Design a binder for this molecule. Structure first.
Ligand SMILES: Cc1c[nH]c2ncnc(N3CC[C@@H](N)C3)c12
Lengths: 336, 20
């Protein structure tokens, strides 16, 4: 069952070489409510006039993207999303550009971000965190085998589907990396030390981020927090972690080998690869196969009210979509 | 408590990606 990965690499290679282009237009969708806002874009709930199906539509202002030096990151995002396929990665359904914007329309995930659930209840139990963690391990195994590094693992980007399973969204920082890359990007709390020290770094930054996610899920706070990003950066590069007293000793152990500044010593990045993680004490009762197949009982199944309910998501203030009458960033996005 | 410390910090909302 590494033949699964061989076929997965061949499909990804084929979808990589010849990418779908311009497969819907704005005026086929009714825009409803913003469901989230980012540094660069915003995502709206959306109803396709012809089938009536609901989607999540990311909108990106081409000019804002050129301003914040996010072009290749934006081309990377689309190219990768259209080229991948895995249960716990959100489907891209359509993409297109008009005079002013890039648009990526994806499956609607109605349970809201892990982030909001987690903040409301403080923390998750260890069996629950474990169940969420397993999905990410499987997903990182998959993406790394395609030489894909993700780079923005965080509660905010993990949406909970109707079966209570994760769907990972926001591939803004996902890059196809042979060996090594250098862009300072990510989210401060989740950044590996390599990135902060402007070192030049590999897929092992995602395993670092995974340790943080699991800490935060089980602690209710991140292992490195302060009021400003540079100060988080100092806490991180110290490599100085304290676990709550209730973390099980298996969890302390896993987290120490994940929250490990020394690359030669970091789980994920070793002779044994991902199996150092999969075969570790704390994941011992995890059925990896039943997880991939979604046959495990989920910690919790979100409140359903209907097609087009957004009670699981916070409210944002709106901004209307202006399309311009003259094209705005031609050759920069020729390939989108 | 550390959580008490976390709750009173100024980083308890959605966190944004870093720019440059
Ligand atoms: C990005 C995305 C895909 N599908 C979605 N379904 C609901 N909400 C989404 N977003 C809300 C917060 C953003 N982090 C992404 C999405």
């Amino acid at each position: 069952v590494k033949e699964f990965l061989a076929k997965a690499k061949e499909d990804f290679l084929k979808k990589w070489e010849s990418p779908a282009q311009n497969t819907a237009h704005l005026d086929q969708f009714e825009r409803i409510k913003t469901l989230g806002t980012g540094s660069f874009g915003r995502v709206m709930l959306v109803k396709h006039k012809e089938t009536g199906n609901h989607y999540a539509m990311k909108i990106l202002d081409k000019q804002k993207v050129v301003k914040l030096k996010q072009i290749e990151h934006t081309l990377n995002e689309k190219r990768i999303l259209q080229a991948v396929n895995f249960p716990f990665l959100v489907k891209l359904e359509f993409s297109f550009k008009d005079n002013s914007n890039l648009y990526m329309v994806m499956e609607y995930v109605p349970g809201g971000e892990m982030f909001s659930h987690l903040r409301r209840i403080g923390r998750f139990s260890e069996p629950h965190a474990r169940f969420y963690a397993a999905q990410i391990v499987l997903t990182f195994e998959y993406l790394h085998s395609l030489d894909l590094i993700y780079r923005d693992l965080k509660p905010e980007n993990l949406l909970i589907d109707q079966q209570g399973y994760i769907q990972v969204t926001d591939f803004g920082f996902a890059k196809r990396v042979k060996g090594r890359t250098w862009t300072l990007c990510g989210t401060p709390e989740y950044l590996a030390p390599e990135i902060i020290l402007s070192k030049g770094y590999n897929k092992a930054v995602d395993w670092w981020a995974l340790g943080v996610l699991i800490y935060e899920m089980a602690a209710g706070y991140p292992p490195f927090f302060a009021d400003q990003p540079i100060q988080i950066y100092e806490k991180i590069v110290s490599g100085k972690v304290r676990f709550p007293s209730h973390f099980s000793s298996d969890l302390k152990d896993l987290l120490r080998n994940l929250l490990q500044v020394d690359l030669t010593k970091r789980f994920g990045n070793l002779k044994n690869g991902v199996n150092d993680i999969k075969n570790h004490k704390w994941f011992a009762t995890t059925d990896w196969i039943a997880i991939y197949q979604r046959k495990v009982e989920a910690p919790f199944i979100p409140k359903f009210k209907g097609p087009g309910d957004t009670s699981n998501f916070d409210d944002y203030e709106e901004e209307e979509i202006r399309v311009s009458i003259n094209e705005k960033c031609g050759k920069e996005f020729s390939e989108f | 408590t550390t959580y008490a410390d976390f709750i009173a910090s100024g980083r308890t909302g959605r966190r944004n990606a870093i720019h440059d």
